[model samples]
Target: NSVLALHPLSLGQEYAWRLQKAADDSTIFNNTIGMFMTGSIDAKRLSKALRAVLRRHEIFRTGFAAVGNNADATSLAQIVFGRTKNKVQVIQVADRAGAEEGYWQLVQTQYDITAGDTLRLVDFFWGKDEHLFVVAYHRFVGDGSTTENIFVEASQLYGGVTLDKHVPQFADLATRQREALESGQMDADLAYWESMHHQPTGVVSPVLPRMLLGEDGLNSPNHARQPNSWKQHEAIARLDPMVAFRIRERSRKHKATPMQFYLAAYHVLLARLTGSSDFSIGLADTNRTNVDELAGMGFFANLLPLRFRNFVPHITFGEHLVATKDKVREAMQHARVPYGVLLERLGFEVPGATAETAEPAPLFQAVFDYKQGQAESGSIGSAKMTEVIATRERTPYDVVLEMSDDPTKDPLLTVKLQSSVYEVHHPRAFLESYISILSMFSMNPALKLA
Candidate 1:
C-alpha cells in the first residue's frame, strides 16, 4: 500500500478521537480539558510540522460527513493541516478569555475536511503574550493510550525541533515501521497474540455505563460539587530527581519502560499501605495490537490488570527497574484484549447493550497509566511552552493517578492526584502522605499502595 504521508484532513486519521468521547462520557470530560500549550514558536514552522504530524496520524486528519452522508459511516472528519493552503484558521488574540472562547468555538463547531485519513493541525497563534497549539483531537476514534503517545511524542518532537532546529519527522518513523512490519520483524508479535487468542465468553464490568447520569445517558444534574463541601485525600512522593534519573537510565538499559518504575513505586506504596506483598492495579490497555500504523501513534485506551509482587522491596531504583522489566515487556507486547472479554471470562454480560459497550470490566478500582510527565518536549509548541508544565486541576474521573516528570523542575518529581468522588481536603494529605511514602522507599523499600 502506498503511504499517505501527512494529510491533516485525511478522513481515516480523524475518526478515532470523537468516537472515543461519544463512546464514554467520562472520556468527554478529560477531552474537555484537552491541552493547548503556548510559547515562542513560529506559526509557519510549527504549522508545517503539524501538517506532517496530522498526515502521519489518520486519527487527526478526519472530519464529519455532510448531512446527506450516513452518520454511522461518520460525522466528524479530519481538518487537513495545510502548509501552503489557508484552510485552517490561525489568529492571535490579546484577550485570553476571548481567545480561548474563540478557539473553543472552533473546536466545537462543525469539523472540516473529508476523504482520506490525513491528520491535520490547527493553530491559535496568540502572538506576543503566547503562541499556543492545540493537539486537535478526534477522541473515540482510537483509545487513550494512542492519543497520549501522540501528544507526548509531539511534545518531544516540538521541543527538540525548537531547541536544535530539527523537529522529529513522522515520515522517518513511518518508514522504519513499514520496513519492520512489512519484513518479518513483527511475526513474533503475531505469534504472541495468536497464542493468546481465545473466543471470549463472559463479561467484564465495574467501568463504563456510569450510573452517575441517569437511565438515559445525559449529563447528571449533580454536575456541580457544593461550594466548599469537599472531602478527599491525596499525596505525592517526588521521585528523588537523581534517583529517578537512575531509574530511567536503568529502564532503558534493560529496554524497560517507565511504567515498570511506576509499578515498582505503586507496589511499594500498596505493600506499605495495605501490608500486602502481592498486589495488582488496572492499567491502560492501549487496545492497539501489533498494528504497524499505530506504532508510537494512534489511540487504544483500554485497561489491563498489572500484578507485581516478586519485586524485591530492598532494591535500589535500578534493581527494581530490572526486576520487573520482563513483566512490563510482556504486558506491552500482548495487552490488546478488550476488557469486555476479560469480564466475560470472569462471568458478566449485557442483556442487550449498544455497540458502544460490549460489556463491562470486573473492576473500576484501577489506575490510568496517564504518562503525562517525564518526557521533556511532550508537545510541539513555541518558547513560552517549550518547557512549561501546568499544574493539575481536579478533573472528573472515578479516581486518577498519573506518573509525571515535570519538564522544567529538572530532577524534581511530583505525584499529584484529583478525586471527584472523594473529599476535598484529600489532595493536600495526598501530597504530605506521598512525601512520607518516598522517604520509606529511600530509607528502606517498606510501604503500601494507594
Candidate 2:
C-alpha cells in the first residue's frame, strides 16, 4: 500500500491509542458486533460490501507512526494508505454454540493499529442456511456512532445500493482539529475545564462499604501492583413499558427530559448505597453537531465528567431533577474539550491514570452511557439479521450502566461490574434497585431521599 496523506492524530484517536498502549490486552479497545442471519448467503457479495466500506472510509486504512525516524519518538501521526485489500473470512462451525465461541475468539484477538490492521470481518457458518457474521473495529478507527454508520452502509451496499463518495474523510477532520489547536482556538474551553477541576470539592471519590471493598480497600499496596487484572460481569434488565412511559411524561411535566430524570435517580441511588453525596460519573457525548459530521465516520464522541456535589437526604426528587438538568446543560456546553487534555491539565499523566489497571482515574469509578435509540433486527441482502450478545470479560471502570431508550420499545439497561470489586449478584441487585427507584419517582416526585 502507498501513503495517501498524513496528519496529526485527532484528540479522540490519541486517547484511544494511549489506552491501547497502556493495557495488557489490546482487545479491550475493540468495538465488535455480531449478527446472526438465516437464509442463503452470497460470500462474494458480502466481501464486496466489506471492501466498499473500507474504501469509502479512509479511517479504515489509516495507521499510526512516530513523528520522526527516531525510535524513541513520542508524538504519533496518522498515515492514510491509498490502496489496501480487504477480505471477509468464512469459518465453518458445527453448531450455534461453536459459532458463538468463534465470535468471541475473534473479538478477543488484538489488532495491529500501527500497521492499519484495525478492522476484521469473519463469517461463521453452522448449518446450510444459518450464518453468523462478526465485525470488529479498533476504537481508534470508529466510535459508537461511526460503527453504526459502517453497519448501515455495508448492509445497503450488500443490497446493491451505491453510497455517496464525495463525503469528507477522517483525515480532513484531523487536519482541521490540529490547526485549531495550534491557533489557540480551544484555549477558552481548556481554561473552563481547568477551572472546574480546581473547585474546593476537588474530586469526588465514591465511598463504598468497607466490607464490600475488602479489608484494605481499593488503595491497598497489593492492589497497586496488578493492573488490568479484574474480570468483568454483566447483567441486563428492561424497564416496564408503563414505567418508562410514566417517566417520560413526568419528566416533561417537570420541565426536564427523561435522561435528566434517570440521571437524577442514579445520583440518589448512589448516595443511598454508598452514603456519599459527592461524586462524578463519566458521560459519553457524541460530538457530531452538523449534518456532514453526523454522516461521516470517525471517533468523534467524547467522555465528559459530570460532577454532583450537593446531595442531601431530605431533598425532594423533583428538586434534584431540576438541578441535575442544569448540570447536564452546563457540561454539554463545554463538551468539546477532549477528556485526555482535561486529565493532563489536572496534572495526571496520560495513559497512566486512564489505563484499566487496578488504579483507575481518581476522579470517577462509574460511568453512565445513555443511548437514545436501539438497534433493530432487520435484513441484509435478503437474509434475516439479528444481534448476538457476546460475553464480556473486562471493564475499565468499577461499574458502567449502559441504557438504551427507544420510543418504540421499553428502555433496556445493562450493568457491567468489575468482578474482582463486586460479587456476581451485585449487577442484578443494582439493576433491580435502579428500576424500582425510577418507578417510585414516577409515582411520587416529592419523595425525599431518606
Candidate 3:
C-alpha cells in the first residue's frame, strides 16, 4: 500500500508560510479561539468530535517540506499530509483561574508545521456544570473564516446536529491552483500589476516625518516577542448597532460598499494625524471562493498593499469616499496575486533590518483588517458558548486597526487598535476624531474633511 501525499501550497498559503518564517515562535499569526460554557461538556464525546474534524479536512493532517531551493519561499515548497498523531487534550482544572492559565499555555504554543499536525485543543473542566475549551491553530492552515466555520460545525457536531452535505477538500483547490499557474492564466494578472505600478504620479506614495522615526526599543526589532513588554497598547472604539445602520444607508446613497466607507473615514483620520494627503495601508483579502467548504479549512486569506489618494484640494468627504472605492475595486482585480509575487512585480525595496527596530522603512507602517466571522454565538447541545475576545500581542506592523463586523448579531463596529509606535492615548484620540468625522459626514455629505 502507498501513502497519500498532499500537493504544494496554493498561492494564498504562501503568504502565511512566509509570515510564519519571519515570525517564528511568535504567536502573531496564531489563531486562538476560546469559549466559556455553563452547561456540562462531554469530555470523551468532544474529543471524538474533534478527531472527526481532523479526519475530514486533509489540511488538519498536512505538514510542509522545504526543498533545496531555499532562495524563493514558494519555488520548491510542498505540503505533505497523513500519518501524524492528531488528538485533543481535555484537562481537569480546579477553578476559573486554573482554566485561564491552561488557556494561555495553549495560546503560547506554536505549531510544528513540519511534524504534520497543526490542530490543537485543551479544555478545562471545573465541575459538571462549567468548563472552558481553547482551540488554537496556525493561521497558515486556517483563516478567520475557517475558524468561524469550524466552530459552528464543531458546535453542531457535538450537539448531535445532522450535517446535510460533505464539505469540499482543500486538495482539490490546490490542484486547480497549480493547473492555472502552469497554464499561464495568471500572466494577465501579472501584467495588470506591472502596468499599475509602472505609471507615475498615480501610485500616490507616502513621506513619513523623520521626527516620527526615533530610536525606541519599545518597537524593538524582535518586539514581536517581547514577553514582558508593556510598550504596546490596546484601544478600542465602538459604535452602537443603530449607528451601523445609518452608515450602511449613507454608503448605499454614495454607491460604495460599507467597508470602503469605513476605510474612507480611517484615511481621514490618518491624513489629519500625519498631515499627509496620500498614504498607504495593508488590507486583508479573504480570497473568497464562495464555496461553503472552502471556508471550512485552510488559509484562504491574502494581504494587499493599498494606496489611497485624497490630495485633491476642497474635496468633500463624499468625493473622497468615491475615490477610495475606486482604488479598492482596482486592487480587487489583482487581489489573488501573492504578496511576495506582487512585491516582486512592483519592486518593493527591503530596508535594513536589525535587532532594534520594528519599523517598515520601505513599506506601510500601519494596517487595517476588517474581520467578519460567521458565528457570533454558538451552541453545543445544552452548553452554549460565547467567544472570548482579547487584544493580539504580536505583530510586525507598527499600528493595526481591527474593525469587526457581525451582521447576524448587531450592526455595531468595534475598532480595536494595537500599537507600539504611538503613545497610549494616540489610538483613542484618533478614534474620537474618526467618529466625529463620520458623524459630521452623516449630517452633511458635501462637507470637506478640512
In model 1, which regions exceed 4 Å deviation?
1-40, 44-57, 63-87, 95-120, 127-129, 141-258, 271-279, 285-297, 308-326, 338-341, 344-361, 368-384, 387-397, 406-420, 446-450
Clashing pairs in 2: 228-357
Best by TM-score: 2
Which candidate would rank higher by TM-score, 1 or 2? 2
Q: How much lDDT does each candidate structure score?
A: 0.44, 0.73, 0.64
Q: Candidate 1's error at 446, in angstroms?
A: 7.0
Residue-by-residue lDDT tens digits, candidate 1, 285-400: 44444444345453345556665435455556556655667666676765644444344444443212123333222343335454544433355554444432222222223334
By TM-score, is 2 or 3 better? 2
What is the TM-score (0 to 1) of candidate 2?
0.88
Q: Where in model 2 is the C-alpha error above 4 Å?
A: 39-41, 69-73, 200-230, 351-357, 377-379, 390-395
lDDT (10s digit) by residue, model 2, range 359-407: 5554566778887854542356666765556433244567778887866
Best by lDDT: 2
Q: What is the lDDT of candidate 3?
A: 0.64
